[PDB]
Design a protein around this ligand. Structure first.
Ligand SMILES: O=C1CCCN1c1cccc(OCc2nc3ccc(-c4ccc(=O)[nH]c4)cc3n2Cc2ccccc2OC(F)F)c1
Lengths: 146, 147, 133
């Protein structure tokens, strides 16, 4: 008997230039048991405890400057409050000393949260141009009802 | 649907308590469920088994100082049968390669899967709370999830 | 509990070999040929962590990769990431995890490209697991 757990696993569009865009209509990606993908946000169908997780992989060609900053943030908007709050957020200086060999920064973010029916979750970054799409499974965003 | 019964916790750094690292579950988007407690800044495991522990602290500094900086983040475990701190996980980072002749950001991620015992006390501590960053929620958290 | 479930850990020499002997392996999941075999079509949470270590930075530029693959009941990346670590020692884990609709009889691999940089001190940080939803 299949699970009725609301779940989703969405992957980033490699040819969406200038943006981090989630897709479900791709191999090994899904929306099930009521989770919707609307306006690039995962929409929660029922209240409960959820795992929420996201991966982005950044790459640079050497370190031209010590100043490049990288950000990756999961956000929540609850229907009652109509406000947008970070659940999980990382900021990273990839370059300590100026350089030209390629560098990589994977950021995985996850945890368990109390969510409400109709919440909208978003997973966002500051620099889509630094995203790497060399192989599949490098940029994803999901939730799993516990 | 039947709400899960697995013990889980996600506590966040108190953003009001600068100069300190104080964990809260009484804060937006933080929680304890199914017997996990937060007591004396420590997570307390209600039942035996494998748990995921996960955690992030975010550090930030303005340029680089004279005295070389090391940042440490450590997760340790006090057992009822052995009530002194045993480190389970630790990580360090030198945020600074040379003294500045510009902000830097250094997240430390730290987590793993461990056999825990009922009544285990879990602490997540850092050496440099003056470099810790709470400017926004979601940067500093500490959680466990029973397998 | 009846739900398929597995938590295996690494051992061995120059390889990433998964063992079922702080580990689990129940309810129809099998560890065959270093891959996990799915006993029934359904939704699964799949996860892993590997930890790399080294001392100082060599003159050849090392890339660390770690990947979980689906082997149909062809081989496809489900989860994958890359780190660039560069005579002081250094430590670098890689995290993977997500939910996936799987078919009965699929296999799952979790592999690294440089077993020579693998660690075996923190048993808590080298593992590979699944749980049926
Ligand atoms: O500490 C930090 C800071 C930043 C990242 N990080 C960290 C530390 C360790 C591992 C890790 O990722 C690998 C990992 N090991 C697991 C071991 C066990 C489980 C698990 C969860 C539920 C369950 O019922 N059984 C098993 C999940 C694991 N994951 C992925 C993961 C981590 C956190 C939240 C959710 C999630 O899964 C996602 F939904 F798919 C990440």
């Amino acid at each position: 008997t299949p699970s009725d757990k609301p779940v989703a696993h969405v992957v980033a569009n490699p040819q969406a230039e200038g943006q981090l865009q989630w897709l479900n209509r791709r191999a090994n990606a899904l929306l099930a048991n009521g989770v919707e993908l609307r306006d690039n946000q995962l929409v929660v169908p029922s209240e409960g405890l959820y795992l929420i997780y996201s991966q982005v992989l950044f790459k640079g060609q050497g370190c031209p400057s010590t100043h490049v900053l990288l950000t990756h943030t999961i956000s929540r908007i609850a229907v009652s409050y109509q406000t947008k709050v970070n659940l999980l957020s990382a900021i990273k200086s990839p370059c300590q000393r100026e350089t030209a060999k390629p560098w990589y920064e994977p950021i995985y973010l996850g945890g368990v949260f109390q969510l409400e029916k109709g919440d909208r979750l978003s997973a966002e970054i500051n620099r889509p141009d630094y995203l790497d799409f060399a192989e599949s499974g490098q940029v994803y965003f999901g939730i799993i009802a516990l």
